[PDB]
Design a protein around this ligand. Structure first.
Ligand SMILES: CC(C)C(=O)c1c(C(C)C)nn2ccccc12
Ligand SMILES: [Cl-]
Ligand SMILES: [Cl-]
Ligand SMILES: [Cl-]
Ligand SMILES: [Cl-]
Ligand SMILES: [Cl-]
Ligand SMILES: [Cl-]
Lengths: 116, 116, 116
C-alpha cells in the first residue's frame, strides 16, 4: 500500500501553517484506510500558477494511490482536501484541481523493489 | 471540463515573461475549445534538469484534460506548445517533451467534488 | 523513444553531487536500453515533504517511458534507482517511492509532433 499526495500552490510558504504536512498525512490515512506509514505528502508553495486566467490563490494537486480510488471515494477525498486547502491555505475550492490516479502495485517502487 | 498544463524548465525565472501564464491560458482555451475559466497553468523555472545528457535549455511538460486528447489533437497541441516555448522561453523544440493525459471526469476533483 | 525521470526530495541542494544528473542519464540509458539522447532527468531538492509522517530524508520519484515498463523491469529499475539515491543522496530505500508509467507513443509530444 502506498498513497502520495502533492499540492502545488501560489500561496507563500509563510502562509502554510505549522503542522500542515502532519495533518495531510493523518487525514489521508483516515480517508484511504491505509496506515499512515505508507502515506507520503509533498507541499509546494510560492509557485507561478494561474487558474482560469487569474493568479489569485489556487492549487493543483494529485493523489496517487494503490487502490482506494473510484467515483464515490474521489468525491469524498475532494471534499476533505478542498476543505483543508480552504481552511488552512485560504484557497477557494473552486480554484483547486485534484487529479486522482489508481496505481497498479507493480508500477510502484519502494525499498529496492516494487509492491507487486 | 478542465485542463491543466505544467511546464518544468531550467530557464531562469527572469526569463519567463510575466504574461506567459495568460498567453498559455488563452491559447490552450482556443486549442481545446474550452472556456479559459477551465484552464489552469503552472510554470516551474530554474530547475535542475538535463535532456539527452545536456543542460542547455529544455522543458518537460504535461497536459491533462477531461477529453480533447487523442492522436491528432496531441500532434496539434505539440506544435502550439513547442511554438510558445520556443518564442517565449527560447527553448529548442527538440528539447521539449509533453506527456498527454486524457482524464476521466470521475478522477478530477474540483470545488469539493469531482466532475463526474 | 523517450524516457523521463524525476526525483523530488527534501535533501538540500548542496548534498546533490556534481555529476548526479549525468549519472542518472547514463544509468537510465543502460537500464532502459535507450540511447542517452532520448533520456531526460529532473532533480528537485529542498522540498517540503513527509513520508510516513516523518520529515527525515525521503524521495518521491517517477519514471515515464515509451515501453520498457513492466513487473520485472520495474523491480530492476527500483533496485538501481534506490541504490543511487542511497549512495549519492543518503536516502533510505524504504523512504523512496517511484511511480512507473508506460506511455503510449501517441501521448508523448516532442518537437512539434508525437511519437506515434
Ligand atoms: C526519430 C525521432 C522521432 C526520435 O526518436 C528522436 C531523435 C532523432 C534524431 C532520432 N532525437 N531525439 C531526441 C530526443 C527524443 C527523441 C529523439
Ligand atoms: Cl468508489
Ligand atoms: Cl498503474
Ligand atoms: Cl484526436
Ligand atoms: Cl483518468
Ligand atoms: Cl517486465
Ligand atoms: Cl499513455
Amino acid at each position: 500500500p502506498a498513497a502520495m499526495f502533492i499540492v502545488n500552490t501560489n500561496v507563500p510558504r509563510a502562509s502554510v501553517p505549522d503542522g500542515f504536512l502532519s495533518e495531510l498525512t493523518q487525514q489521508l490515512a483516515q480517508a484511504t484506510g491505509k496506515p499512515p506509514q505508507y502515506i507520503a505528502v509533498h507541499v509546494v508553495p510560492d509557485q507561478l500558477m494561474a487558474f482560469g486566467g487569474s493568479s489569485e490563490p489556487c492549487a493543483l494537486c494529485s493523489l496517487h494511490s494503490i487502490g482506494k480510488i473510484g467515483g464515490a471515494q474521489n468525491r469524498s477525498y475532494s471534499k476533505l482536501l478542498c476543505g483543508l486547502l480552504a481552511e488552512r491555505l485560504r484557497i477557494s475550492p473552486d480554484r483547486v484541481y485534484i487529479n486522482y490516479y489508481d496505481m497498479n502495485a507493480a508500477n510502484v517502487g519502494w525499498n529496492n523493489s516494487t509492491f507487486a
